[model samples]
Target: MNQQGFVISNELRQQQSELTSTWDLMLQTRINLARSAARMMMDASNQQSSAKTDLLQNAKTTLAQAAAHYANFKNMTPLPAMAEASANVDEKYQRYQAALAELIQFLDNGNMDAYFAQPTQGMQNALGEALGNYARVSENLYRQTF
Candidate 1:
């Protein structure tokens, strides 16, 4: 296709649309899984209320991968509808990312009070909001439901 575009047959058009949906759904599933993993970290951290070095490590890794996946997804060409909504989500995600970094810094320094303070709790809500955007975005603020 060019700026004016060339004729595409009905069958080819369907195949293109059907296959692109696969990437969107697959990435959606990944985002959902990462959200669950983040919750798992929340519960485990609550159980201790103190430093878990490996736990923080996993949190950082998950954030990195999650952000990467989302950034990759937002750059996709299938739909600008998803791209715009995900940009909103991606920004919110960084707020939560900041909270996680602070939590990890405090934990690594063996400061239980600092690690258990507002920073850790802030992640819960920011993480909650960003994913909330995701669920809604998938449900069609701009396009498609489910």
Candidate 2:
């Protein structure tokens, strides 16, 4: 009976230790979540800092592509149709840029309240916006298949 009592006491101690560790983990998680939320709220504007950098890089690429296209007429005959298609590509690219700017502005303006208004709705909105841009670009590329 004494040995059985000791076994029960040991089991209780083990369970107690596990519960204590689990409680500690929960508290740590809460602390981390709070810190992350604070950082996201306060420092999210810095996220838009990359927008100007990306715009500069994209501008360079667009200019380079235009230069190359301008210079490539010797090998491939310059077709007016190709020029028309490229104009469409440029138009779609501009639309993509405008949509992305709006999204970035939403984040940079600290519009978290608007975005998180309905988490599922927000997700749908983001997906639709992304796919709209993709569709705009894809339409130009798909037209090339013909």
Candidate 3:
């Protein structure tokens, strides 16, 4: 009962209590960082070309870091009340990232398309919206669950 599972110990449903400090934070940050990169990439429009490539490159790198945060979230199990939110965030972000990869292009010229505009930012905002709902639902549940 004290120890188990590979990366986190306490397999299956048993893992929730131990991860309380973050359970949702990890997921929330995933949402946050991905949006950060999306904003950073879109902002490339005003940057001077010489510096914009670096800016866009930096954006992609941060986007990747955002992916890393989600991967970390995967390592921990969600509390029961949070499971739906967790799954939704996972799904929403998948769409957001996919939009980022194909629709949003990164160019060597330091200028890129938002797919030249819209949907990626739309996806970014949607993720934020999802996080908002999750926070509301989770905080209420958190009071009861923990």
Q: lDDT winner among the candidates?
A: 3
C-alpha lDDT of all candidate models, in order: 0.48, 0.38, 0.52
Residue 27 of model 1, lDDT score: 39
Q: Is candidate 1 or candidate 3 better by TM-score?
A: 3
Model 3 error, position 133 (Å): 1.3
Candidate 3, superposed: residue stretches over 4 Å from native: 1-52, 103-114
**Residues forming the 10-long window of minimal summed lDDT in candidate 3:** 12-21
Q: Once model 3 is optimally superposed onto the true structure by TM-score, how far is the C-alpha of residue 77 displaced, in angstroms?
A: 2.0
- Candidate 2's error at 1, in angstroms? 2.5
Clashing pairs in 3: 113-116, 114-117
Q: Count the backbone clashes (under 3 Å) in each candidate.
A: 0, 0, 2
lDDT score at residue 78, model 3, on the 0-100 scale:
72
**On residues 54-126, what C-alpha lDDT tens digit does candidate 1 reach at each position?**
4555555655655555455445443445565556555665666566556556555665565545444454555
Instruction: lDDT winner between 2 and 3, please give it.
Output: 3
Compute the lDDT for candidate 1.
Answer: 0.48
Higher-lDDT candidate among 1 and 2?
Answer: 1
Arranged by TM-score, best first: 3, 1, 2
lDDT for residue 146 in candidate 3, whole number 0-100: 23
TM-scores of the candidates in the order shown = 0.48, 0.31, 0.56
